[PDB]
Each structure stands twice: as C-alpha cells, then as structure tokens.
Amino acid sequence: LQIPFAMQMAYRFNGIGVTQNVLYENQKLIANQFNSAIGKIQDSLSSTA
Amino acid sequence: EGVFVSNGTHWFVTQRNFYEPQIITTDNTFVSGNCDVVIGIVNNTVYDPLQPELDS
Ligand SMILES: *[C@@H]1O[C@H](CO)[C@@H](O[C@@H]2O[C@H](CO)[C@@H](O)[C@H](O)[C@H]2NC(C)=O)[C@H](O)[C@H]1NC(C)=O
Ligand SMILES: *[C@@H]1O[C@H](CO)[C@@H](O)[C@H](O)[C@H]1NC(C)=O
Ligand SMILES: *[C@@H]1O[C@H](CO)[C@@H](O)[C@H](O)[C@H]1NC(C)=O
C-alpha cells in the first residue's frame, strides 16, 4: 500500500513513542542526519575490509 | 491515532488499517505550532463540538 515517505517515518516515530509533529517540524534535520549517516557507511566500507 | 485522507473534494481522518472516514474535529486531532513549518500541510476546517453547544 503506497504512503509518502515522510508519513511512513511519522508512523515509525509514533512506534518508538515520539509524537508525529516531532518528525514534521524537524523533517530536513532528520533527512540530513540520515543522508550524512549513509555517507559514513559508504566511507567506512571503502576505508577498511 | 489516524491519517488525513481526501476523496477529491472533502477531508476526513481514518484509522490506518481499515477505511472508516470521520469528520476532522478538535477531538480527532492535536495542535502543534503554526502553518509555516510542515512540508505539504493543507488548508481545511477543523470542527469544534463545543461551539454549537455554546450556540444553544
Ligand atoms: C466526498 O465525500 C463527501 C461527503 O460524503 C461527498 O459529498 C456528498 O455527496 C453527495 C452526492 O453528490 C451529496 O448528496 C451530499 O449532499 C454531499 N455531502 C456533503 C456534506 O457535501 C462528496 O460527493 C465526495 N466526493 C467525491 C469526489 O466522491
Ligand atoms: C510533490 O511532488 C510534486 C512532483 O514532484 C511537486 O510538484 C510538488 O511541489 C510536491 N509537493 C510537496 C509538498 O512536496
Ligand atoms: C492557506 O490559507 C492561508 C490563509 O487563508 C493562505 O495565506 C494560503 O495562501 C493558503 N495556502 C494554500 C496552499 O492555498
């Protein structure tokens, strides 16, 4: 069943006991922290076996 | 405890796992802050059940 990705992430915030407005009010910060953290995976896997 | 949904003309709130549309009210919803921050927010009436009761 399709759902917009930011709305799926608001359901996942509700699942950890954090209210949905905490996602929508911080959505760019949350997306930047995710995009940044995936760059750390990329570099760490390239850096060491 | 729901999701906001539209049939193309009207806005409702539903439980997430089963389509059951309800009028959007001050009891179905909570406020946080103003219209400026949320990406993709839409303009609609939110009904307040007390106001016709005060109109009695
Ligand atoms: C969206 O839902 C509303 C509310 O159920 C529908 O509005 C009703 O439509 C019928 C048929 O046109 C009318 O007899 C009623 O008087 C309408 N009620 C209200 C409160 O407007 C609306 O038709 C639905 N829209 C779509 C595109 O299905
Ligand atoms: C939704 O996506 C469409 C197509 O990319 C775009 O025109 C629109 O501005 C977007 N709206 C929001 C709130 O993201
Ligand atoms: C929503 O309503 C406000 C106040 O009536 C108005 O300034 C704004 O342009 C509206 N937004 C949209 C997307 O229509």
| Nearest CA distance, A43 vs chain B (angstrom) | 31
Closest CA to B3 of A15, A36, A8, A27: A8
Q: Contact at 8 Å (CB) between B23 and B44?
A: no
Which of B9-47 are b and which e, b meaning 16 or more Cβ less than 10 Å from the residue's Cβ?
eebbbeeeeeeeeeebeeebeeeeeeeeebeeeeeeeee
Tokens of A43: 């570099």
* Structural resolution in Å: 2.8
Query: How far out from the chain centre does Cα B22 lie?
Result: 8
A11 vs B contacts (CB less than 8 Å): 16
Q: Which two tokens stand for residue B10?
A: 């009207």
CA dihedral B20, B25, B27, B31 (to 10 degrees): 120
d(C-alpha B4, C-alpha A18), whole Å: 19
Q: What tokens appear for B16 in the block?
A: 């997430």
- The three-point CA angle B30-B40-B7 to 5° equals 80
**Ligand 2 neighbour B39 (Cβ under 6 A):** yes
Distance from the alpha carbon of residue B16 to the mean position of ligand 2, in angstroms: 23
Three-state secondary structure along A1-49?
CCCCHHHHHHHHHHHCCCCCHHHHCCHHHHHHHHHHHHHHHHHHHHHCC
Whether residue B16 lies within 8 A of chain A, CB to CB, comes out as yes
Q: Is some CB atom of chain A closer than 8 A to the CB atom of B35?
A: no
Return the SS3 of B42. coil
Q: Which residues of chain B does A17 touch, with a Cβ-Cβ cutoff of 8 Å?
A: none
